[PDB]
Design an enzyme around this catalytic site. Structure first.
Site, PDB file in Angstrom:
ATOM      1  N   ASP A  29       2.207   7.415   4.901  1.00  0.00           N
ATOM      2  CA  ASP A  29       2.262   6.262   4.961  1.00  0.00           C
ATOM      3  C   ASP A  29       3.012   5.780   3.353  1.00  0.00           C
ATOM      4  O   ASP A  29       2.593   6.262   2.189  1.00  0.00           O
ATOM      5  CB  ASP A  29       1.399   5.433   5.363  1.00  0.00           C
ATOM      6  CG  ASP A  29       1.745   4.205   6.341  1.00  0.00           C
ATOM      7  OD1 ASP A  29       2.905   4.023   6.128  1.00  0.00           O
ATOM      8  OD2 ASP A  29       1.267   3.774   7.022  1.00  0.00           O
ATOM      9  N   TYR A  83       0.665  -1.156   0.075  1.00  0.00           N
ATOM     10  CA  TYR A  83      -0.174   0.100  -0.273  1.00  0.00           C
ATOM     11  C   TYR A  83       1.089   0.744  -0.244  1.00  0.00           C
ATOM     12  O   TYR A  83       2.172   1.034   0.249  1.00  0.00           O
ATOM     13  CB  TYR A  83      -1.116   0.131   1.000  1.00  0.00           C
ATOM     14  CG  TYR A  83      -0.255  -0.222   2.901  1.00  0.00           C
ATOM     15  CD1 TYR A  83       0.452  -0.474   3.512  1.00  0.00           C
ATOM     16  CD2 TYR A  83       0.036   1.253   2.908  1.00  0.00           C
ATOM     17  CE1 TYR A  83       0.905  -0.707   4.559  1.00  0.00           C
ATOM     18  CE2 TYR A  83       0.282   1.713   4.272  1.00  0.00           C
ATOM     19  CZ  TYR A  83       1.222   0.722   5.375  1.00  0.00           C
ATOM     20  OH  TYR A  83       1.648   0.275   6.161  1.00  0.00           O
ATOM     21  N   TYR A  93     -11.727   8.694  10.278  1.00  0.00           N
ATOM     22  CA  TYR A  93     -10.042   9.165  11.425  1.00  0.00           C
ATOM     23  C   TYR A  93     -11.398  10.587  11.287  1.00  0.00           C
ATOM     24  O   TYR A  93     -10.248  11.763  12.099  1.00  0.00           O
ATOM     25  CB  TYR A  93      -9.039   9.575  10.874  1.00  0.00           C
ATOM     26  CG  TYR A  93      -8.124   8.723  11.237  1.00  0.00           C
ATOM     27  CD1 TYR A  93      -7.751   8.142  12.567  1.00  0.00           C
ATOM     28  CD2 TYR A  93      -7.896   7.629   9.930  1.00  0.00           C
ATOM     29  CE1 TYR A  93      -6.841   7.626  12.761  1.00  0.00           C
ATOM     30  CE2 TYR A  93      -6.987   6.667  10.611  1.00  0.00           C
ATOM     31  CZ  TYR A  93      -6.282   5.645  11.986  1.00  0.00           C
ATOM     32  OH  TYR A  93      -5.483   5.102  11.747  1.00  0.00           O
ATOM     33  N   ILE A 130      -8.433  -0.439   9.275  1.00  0.00           N
ATOM     34  CA  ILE A 130     -10.157   0.804   9.345  1.00  0.00           C
ATOM     35  C   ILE A 130     -10.714   0.156   8.556  1.00  0.00           C
ATOM     36  O   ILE A 130     -10.039  -0.629   7.655  1.00  0.00           O
ATOM     37  CB  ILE A 130      -9.080   2.125   9.291  1.00  0.00           C
ATOM     38  CG1 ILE A 130      -9.029   2.361   7.578  1.00  0.00           C
ATOM     39  CG2 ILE A 130      -8.540   3.026  10.050  1.00  0.00           C
ATOM     40  CD1 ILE A 130      -8.250   3.849   7.016  1.00  0.00           C
ATOM     41  N   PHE A 144      -5.339   6.695  -1.100  1.00  0.00           N
ATOM     42  CA  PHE A 144      -4.566   5.076  -0.913  1.00  0.00           C
ATOM     43  C   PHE A 144      -4.626   4.298  -2.724  1.00  0.00           C
ATOM     44  O   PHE A 144      -4.785   3.866  -3.081  1.00  0.00           O
ATOM     45  CB  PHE A 144      -5.029   3.904   0.262  1.00  0.00           C
ATOM     46  CG  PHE A 144      -5.182   4.626   0.954  1.00  0.00           C
ATOM     47  CD1 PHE A 144      -3.874   4.769   2.235  1.00  0.00           C
ATOM     48  CD2 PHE A 144      -5.873   4.982   1.871  1.00  0.00           C
ATOM     49  CE1 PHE A 144      -3.694   4.724   3.777  1.00  0.00           C
ATOM     50  CE2 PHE A 144      -6.242   5.432   3.260  1.00  0.00           C
ATOM     51  CZ  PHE A 144      -4.600   5.414   3.836  1.00  0.00           C
TER      52      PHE A 144
END
Length: 107
Positions: free
Chosen positions: A37, A26, A82, A56, A99
């Site tokens: 990330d 990812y 979030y 998540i 993502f």
């Protein structure tokens, strides 16, 4: 709302099921912002299973709509990840999540 935008190639028949551990390269991305990330930097491609609420909810349902070899593009709404809480210092509240996800699974 999980909105898949697929880069095509794969098989379209090997679908993830419950309790199956899958391996994902990812890549996190913030809309109108930088990265936050990456699993490509650590080269430790995040072995995780399906159906235990570890990740998540926006990332979770996007992997079940993929197959082996495919390359999707997640767009997570704030309410599933979030947007009320905000991950302190890394993900601010009311954030839209992007993502780049490749599903290269086993099992």
């Amino acid at each position: 709302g999980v909105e898949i935008e697929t880069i095509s190639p794969g098989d379209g028949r090997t679908f993830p099921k419950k309790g199956q551990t899958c391996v994902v390269h990812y890549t996190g991305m913030l809309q109108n912002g930088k990265k936050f990330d990456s699993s490509r930097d650590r080269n430790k491609p995040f072995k995780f299973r399906i159906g235990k609420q570890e990740v998540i909810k926006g990332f979770e349902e996007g992997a079940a709509q993929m197959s082996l070899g495919q390359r999707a593009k997640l767009t997570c709404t704030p309410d599933v990840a979030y947007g009320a809480t905000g991950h302190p210092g890394v993900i601010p509240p009311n954030a839209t999540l992007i993502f780049d996800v490749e599903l290269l699974n086993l099992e």
